[PDB]
């Protein structure tokens, strides 16, 4: 309860950590920790009745977020870990179920069968791109095939529990918490041409309420980088 990092404080009360490992450290690298280890809270999305899902690219969403956006442009390489706090606040009269996954290397596929999706359609800088429950038409310029039941990666959406995940069931639970290490083939990689993670939120059992209750449940995603180190003189 009331954990603080740097000059920011959140409030909690179960945490699932990575693939079993805690994030730790390793020309020579420099290790900054004061101006990066803090809670960057993204703005809140609205979960309505006919919602489909959201996704963020993780070393892209904090690209304009304070001094962490300055270390992405001034330094060439770098490696980070993450600590993702998801919490949605609903009353006892609402119902639903979310699935919160953190997929490493989520290569997505274009709607046009010959091209690859362009840069603005894969990742929004601290703004969630959204799923659909239909198909996206092929004859357009360039967009992501974002049918939710195939998760945009050509794979059955029920089997997405093999990646490190956590359930948010509004009957019993309220929040999720993930701690993710650095998973890449090279020990230190570029932070502009590569997104090594992907945070997905998919409503399996959709929201329901009676007439009179508030028709939306806001979700709040709070990310804090752990054990970051860069490469420079």
């Amino acid at each position, epitope marked *: 309860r009331s954990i603080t990092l740097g000059n920011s404080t959140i409030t909690t009360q179960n945490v699932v950590v990575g693939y079993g490992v805690w994030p730790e450290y390793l020309d020579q690298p420099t290790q900054p920790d004061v101006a990066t280890c803090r809670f960057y809270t993204l703005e809140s999305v609205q979960w309505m009745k*006919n*919602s*489909a899902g959201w996704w963020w690219k993780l070393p892209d969403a904090l690209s304009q977020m304070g001094l962490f956006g300055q270390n992405m442009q001034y330094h060439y390489l770098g490696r980070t870990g993450y600590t993702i706090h998801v919490q949605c606040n609903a009353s006892k009269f609402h119902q639903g179920c979310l699935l919160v996954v953190c997929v490493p290397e989520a290569e997505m596929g274009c709607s046009n069968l010959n091209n690859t999706p362009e*840069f603005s*359609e894969l990742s929004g800088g601290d*703004s969630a*791109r959204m799923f*659909t429950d239909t198909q996206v038409g*092929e004859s357009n*310029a360039k967009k992501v095939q974002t049918a939710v039941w195939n998760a945009g990666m050509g794979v059955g959406v029920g089997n997405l529990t093999i990646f490190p995940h956590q359930w948010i069931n509004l009957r019993t639970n309220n929040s999720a918490t993930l701690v993710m290490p650095y998973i890449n083939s090279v020990p230190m990689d570029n932070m502009f041409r590569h997104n090594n993670l992907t945070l997905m939120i998919i409503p399996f059992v959709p929201l329901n309420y009676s007439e009179g209750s508030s028709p939306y449940v806001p979700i709040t995603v709070t990310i804090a980088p752990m054990c970051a180190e860069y490469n420079g003189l």
Partner: antibody
Amino acid sequence: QVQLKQSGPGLVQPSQSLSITCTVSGFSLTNYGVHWVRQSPGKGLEWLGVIWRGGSTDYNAAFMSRLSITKDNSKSQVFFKMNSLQADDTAIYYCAKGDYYGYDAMDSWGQGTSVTVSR
Amino acid sequence: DIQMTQSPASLSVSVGETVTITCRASENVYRNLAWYQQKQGKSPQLLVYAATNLADGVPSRFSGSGSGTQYSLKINSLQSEDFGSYFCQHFWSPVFTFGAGTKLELK
């Protein structure tokens, strides 16, 4: 939250150029695309063209050579231009933003500037 | 491209009936459909998108159903503010083509 609005020339001579500017408010052009819809009393509604959020455009087939839609992310404005302006273009022109929850539908529309092409 | 044939062209009802407006596509669009309502001399408003889902502030009287090439919209109980023009649009592929249009007189 307040949304987009436009300002146009009002009326043109035949075989002249038309240029309307739709200026937005409260959202960015890096997250949405803007469609251009023409409401006609004779042929009904028709979709003229669109500029996507990446900068790519896609125009109608019948109005391909005459149209050109461009935008600027910084000053938050979209310019479109139609040329040679025959007699059938007596209509009202709307600008409306797309990507309503990622479904490519029109969220909210401009006020519309009706044009008259005759002398 | 693909044409949307909307039927009927006009209707004349009172307050409180069940009406049904259908529009049929030339080929399959995979539920990529939007429904609009335009009043007298104003900008049209989004009513039902993706052929089932309701809009943000649209009341729960409206309903859309259909899949494939056949779609429909229903109002269970009319009110005084529910007449005007209604159009259907596919957003499956460019070029997007609107429907013909229907009118409610509320006699």
